[PDB]
Enzyme design. Structure first.
Site, PDB file in Angstrom:
ATOM      1  N   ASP A 140       0.832  -1.206   0.000  1.00  0.00           N
ATOM      2  CA  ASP A 140       0.000   0.000   0.000  1.00  0.00           C
ATOM      3  C   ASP A 140       0.871   1.262   0.000  1.00  0.00           C
ATOM      4  OD1 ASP A 140      -2.393   1.430   0.068  1.00  0.00           O
ATOM      5  OD2 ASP A 140      -3.096   0.375   1.819  1.00  0.00           O
ATOM      6  N   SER A 172       0.328  -0.572  -5.073  1.00  0.00           N
ATOM      7  CA  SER A 172      -0.738   0.421  -5.069  1.00  0.00           C
ATOM      8  C   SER A 172      -0.242   1.781  -5.514  1.00  0.00           C
ATOM      9  CB  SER A 172      -1.355   0.538  -3.671  1.00  0.00           C
ATOM     10  OG  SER A 172      -1.938  -0.672  -3.212  1.00  0.00           O
ATOM     11  N   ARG A 197      -2.885  -1.578  -8.241  1.00  0.00           N
ATOM     12  CA  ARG A 197      -4.198  -1.003  -8.011  1.00  0.00           C
ATOM     13  C   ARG A 197      -4.138   0.385  -8.642  1.00  0.00           C
ATOM     14  NH1 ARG A 197      -7.012  -1.462  -3.604  1.00  0.00           N
ATOM     15  NH2 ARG A 197      -8.147   0.293  -4.488  1.00  0.00           N
ATOM     16  N   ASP A 201     -10.605   2.307  -3.901  1.00  0.00           N
ATOM     17  CA  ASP A 201     -10.998   1.060  -3.250  1.00  0.00           C
ATOM     18  C   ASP A 201     -12.455   0.762  -3.592  1.00  0.00           C
ATOM     19  OD1 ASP A 201      -8.516   1.333  -1.979  1.00  0.00           O
ATOM     20  OD2 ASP A 201      -9.408   1.813  -0.015  1.00  0.00           O
TER      21      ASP A 201
HETATM   22  C1  LIG Z   1      -5.153   1.552  -3.257  1.00  0.00           C
HETATM   23  C2  LIG Z   1      -4.986   0.674  -2.018  1.00  0.00           C
HETATM   24  O1  LIG Z   1      -4.113  -0.201  -1.812  1.00  0.00           O
HETATM   25  N1  LIG Z   1      -5.899   0.914  -1.044  1.00  0.00           N
HETATM   26  C3  LIG Z   1      -5.845   0.169   0.208  1.00  0.00           C
HETATM   27  C4  LIG Z   1      -7.030  -0.730   0.489  1.00  0.00           C
HETATM   28  O2  LIG Z   1      -7.135  -1.730  -0.541  1.00  0.00           O
HETATM   29  C5  LIG Z   1      -6.851  -1.453   1.835  1.00  0.00           C
HETATM   30  O3  LIG Z   1      -5.659  -2.235   1.743  1.00  0.00           O
HETATM   31  C6  LIG Z   1      -6.753  -0.361   2.918  1.00  0.00           C
HETATM   32  C7  LIG Z   1      -6.448  -0.950   4.278  1.00  0.00           C
HETATM   33  O4  LIG Z   1      -6.350   0.089   5.230  1.00  0.00           O
HETATM   34  O5  LIG Z   1      -5.648   0.537   2.616  1.00  0.00           O
HETATM   35  C8  LIG Z   1      -5.764   1.232   1.347  1.00  0.00           C
HETATM   36  O6  LIG Z   1      -6.896   2.050   1.309  1.00  0.00           O
END
Ligand SMILES: CC(=O)N[C@@H]1[C@@H](O)[C@@H](O)[C@@H](CO)O[C@@H]1O
Ligand SMILES: *[C@@H]1O[C@H](CO)[C@@H](O[C@@H]2O[C@H](CO)[C@@H](O)[C@H](O)[C@H]2NC(C)=O)[C@H](O)[C@H]1NC(C)=O
Ligand SMILES: *[C@@H]1O[C@H](CO)[C@@H](O[C@@H]2O[C@H](CO)[C@@H](O)[C@H](O)[C@H]2NC(C)=O)[C@H](O)[C@H]1NC(C)=O
Ligand SMILES: CC(=O)N[C@@H]1[C@@H](O)[C@@H](O)[C@@H](CO)O[C@@H]1O
Ligand SMILES: *[C@@H]1O[C@H](CO)[C@@H](O)[C@H](O)[C@H]1NC(C)=O
Ligand SMILES: *[C@@H]1O[C@H](CO)[C@@H](O)[C@H](O)[C@H]1NC(C)=O
Ligand SMILES: *[C@@H]1O[C@H](CO)[C@@H](O)[C@H](O)[C@H]1NC(C)=O
Ligand SMILES: *[C@@H]1O[C@H](CO)[C@@H](O)[C@H](O)[C@H]1NC(C)=O
Lengths: 388, 388
Positions: A140, A172, A197, A201
């Site tokens: 992330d 991400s 990603r 979300d």
């Molecule tokens: C773009 C991306 O990775 N978004 C992530 C989501 O999928 C989830 O992992 C979340 C957990 O807190 O964190 C971020 O919002």
């Protein structure tokens, strides 16, 4: 990313959308983020026919670690929720012929407030994950600057490789940078990541799915060309089996994610999944098309004023997949056209199979008119094979 | 309207939302608007337990008539789609202990392009319907001016009464005038109509339901006071069992329509309805609350920043109904509060029954904290009875 992995879009289960950051194991023993959740989903995948279809990844998302690294500066799982540690969880999953995925964040903190993987911790964390027996890592990007991400993402790719353990790398990075060029360089992403990603979300609602579908297809010109074996665009988790999608909508997401050559990462409770939801997610032909060896992402080719959208995805064996999507809210709609009108070769004939119903059309000539009946927020999906 | 009818919100089936103006009986024998559709829905209501629960109306909507009146200037059904005429259809429905509803439009044309009921035709049409054995009439308002409607709606009420046949009168007058005062006079509507469509037509989607819910509750101050035995607000048809709503969403519509003391007019194919959809629509306690003798429409009493909304409806026997609604798109939510916090009498105790699960709470004190877990786009509904 040329690490011999993700030659087809990753298939599996991911905890986030459905379970989020639930750490109330006292009141939600089954829904809380704990080692038990992953072990039970692993049993589900191994016992209910998922594994044979290709679903092999059991992925941990945010909120699994302790609120701080140990004294040695290493990441450790939450003591109460993961009493046997990660390595043990991995062995358990491995014993079932499945793979374990984990979550990290290139930054000061994970989006959920857990220990982040700062630049000075990248090599160590990659090392920690490999030692545990991790098979996939989603990185992330909360709490890191664009400059730090430009350094960290490529840096983590190198760190993972150095451990000598093949690890699917999900990035991400693009989402935090807006997902579009020039800020995002998808050529570079293809070199360093297995999947990424690109956008927001997914939430548990049809409008969320539509928002994702519209962003990806509106911008397909700058996204579609960069997907392929080893490096995919990731529109996020499948929410089929959850609270917000109707039956027709559920089939719509599966079909469109397949057109997009998207990872098929389910985020739903496999212990209570409905028969209809299971039947959608386990559709073999659908999976075959999603898993097509060429890895050529499809595109939207038509947007009718009738609120019908048509999608096409080129496949191996000179085949094709077509999706007729209705965004109308009135009633089943009769869409009439011809393969010729859709752009197919002249004077040809195709064997057509309806992916969801199984009905077959022996030899549809490209010049012949045909009608498909599409339900509101639903689809009609075809697999076409040329005759010779 | 004091005609001894609709002392409780009308319950039944209505063709429009699901079947619309489908006149292609050649290709859609079962889904087209024809005498067969209504006869089969009548069998369904009579045989699958609907009739016993209170569902008695089988209503025809737009697109049933011939494209023109006969030579005598009378309305006649479409010859091919209704070969036995309306009276015969009515007898058939009547023989099952059910009632037949029909559709007309105060104007030059029906919204669908069929013969309209102009002012000079009101008495004749009301007369034609009674003779056929009609039990309910929905009078649409396309192609008529506000001045013509001000004259026609009250005029049709008088015409219906003169036939001597008790006929439930559903008026769309308010919808065409914006649904709000001063343009709309709900006191007058209560005197001339049994129920009225205040707002936009419902479409097959969750956003459509939310749009209706939000308009009615935002404007509840000028709507809630005018509903009661014999005269109801009508937020339109139930779309449970169709294409756009998920399971949680379906239960949400049923619960909110019950809070609104809305007519329970189903528009779905009763021949293919799913078990879960059927179970929602046949919930006896839910129906009892909707059919409460006092006819006091409920209201939204809370809008939390947590995206949780709470609704309350006062009932007979000093009882109450509460609906906890989640518009969150993340995960099941724990809403904690107390009856005291919701406004209930101090130092009291209630026997509480969860309308959907059946679970009971023996003696909940108004001062005690309680938690309900609400799923995304779903509800938790309670029936409360004071102890003494
Ligand atoms: C773009 C991306 O990775 N978004 C992530 C989501 O999928 C989830 O992992 C979340 C957990 O807190 O964190 C971020 O919002
Ligand atoms: C580290 O990177 C090397 C390449 O730089 C990876 O080796 C490649 O592996 C694929 C699939 O196994 C082969 O098709 C290529 O021919 C290999 N390239 C080279 C240069 O040998 C290696 O797999 C990576 N290591 C890890 C653990 O990911
Ligand atoms: C026509 O209107 C009269 C009243 O104006 C209706 O009669 C009322 O019927 C209800 C229920 O049957 C009684 O409670 C009232 O006491 C009646 N009022 C009067 C003045 O007698 C009558 O039912 C209407 N006729 C039709 C066919 O709708
Ligand atoms: C407010 C109102 O009655 N709207 C009606 C709708 O319910 C349906 O009857 C349709 C048939 O054409 O006509 C109008 O749009
Ligand atoms: C994108 O990244 C690739 C791979 O490093 C590089 O060759 C290319 O020059 C970059 N494109 C731009 C516009 O910087
Ligand atoms: C095929 O259908 C289209 C309607 O989409 C129509 O315009 C066309 O004339 C039809 N072709 C034939 C040969 O009937
Ligand atoms: C509304 O209609 C009622 C019934 O006819 C009437 O008594 C009242 O005066 C009307 N209100 C207004 C503001 O005209
Ligand atoms: C009841 O719950 C609320 C939270 O909504 C809390 O603020 C309050 O202190 C609780 N009361 C008691 C007696 O625990």
């Amino acid at each position: 990313l040329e690490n011999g992995l993700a030659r087809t879009p990753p298939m599996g289960w991911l905890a986030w959308e459905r379970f989020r950051c639930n750490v109330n194991c006292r009141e939600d023993p089954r829904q809380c983020i704990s080692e038990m959740l992953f072990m039970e989903m692993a049993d589900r995948i191994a016992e209910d026919g998922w594994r044979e279809l290709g679903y092999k990844y059991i992925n941990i998302d945010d909120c699994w670690a302790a609120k701080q690294r140990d004294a040695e500066g290493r990441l450790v799982p939450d003591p109460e929720r993961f009493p046997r540690g990660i390595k043990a969880l991995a062995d358990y999953v491995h014993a079932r012929g499945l793979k374990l995925g984990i979550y990290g964040d290139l930054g000061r903190l994970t989006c959920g407030g857990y220990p982040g993987t700062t630049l000075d911790r990248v090599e160590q964390d990659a090392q920690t994950f490999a030692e545990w027996g991790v098979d996939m890592l989603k990185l992330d990007g909360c709490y890191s600057s664009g400059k730090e991400q430009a350094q960290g993402y490529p840096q983590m790719a190198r760190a993972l490789n150095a451990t000598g353990r093949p690890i699917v790398y999900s990035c991400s990075w693009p989402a935090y940078q807006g997902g579009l060029p020039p800020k995002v360089n998808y050529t570079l992403l293809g070199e360093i990541c297995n999947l990424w990603r690109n956008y927001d979300d997914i939430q548990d609602s049809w409008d969320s799915v539509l928002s994702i579908v519209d962003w990806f297809f509106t911008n397909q010109d700058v996204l579609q060309p960069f997907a392929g074996p080893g490096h995919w665009n990731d529109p996020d988790m499948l929410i089929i089996g959850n609270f917000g999608l109707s039956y027709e909508q559920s089939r719509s997401q599966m079909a469109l994610w397949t057109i997009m050559a998207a990872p098929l990462l389910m985020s739903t409770d496999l212990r209570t999944i409905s028969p209809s939801a299971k039947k959608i997610l386990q559709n073999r032909l659908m999976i075959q098309i999603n898993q097509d060896p060429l890895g050529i992402q499809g595109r939207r080719i038509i947007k009718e004023g009738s609120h019908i959208e048509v999608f096409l995805r080129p496949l191996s064996q000179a085949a094709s997949a077509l999706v007729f999507f209705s965004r109308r809210t009135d009633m089943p709609f009769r869409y009439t056209t011809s393969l010729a009108k859709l752009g197919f070769p002249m004077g040809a004939a195709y064997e057509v199979q309806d992916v969801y119903s199984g009905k077959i059309i022996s030899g549809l000539k490209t010049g012949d008119n045909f009608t498909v009946i599409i339900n509101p927020s639903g689809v009609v999906m075809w697999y076409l094979c040329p005759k010779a």
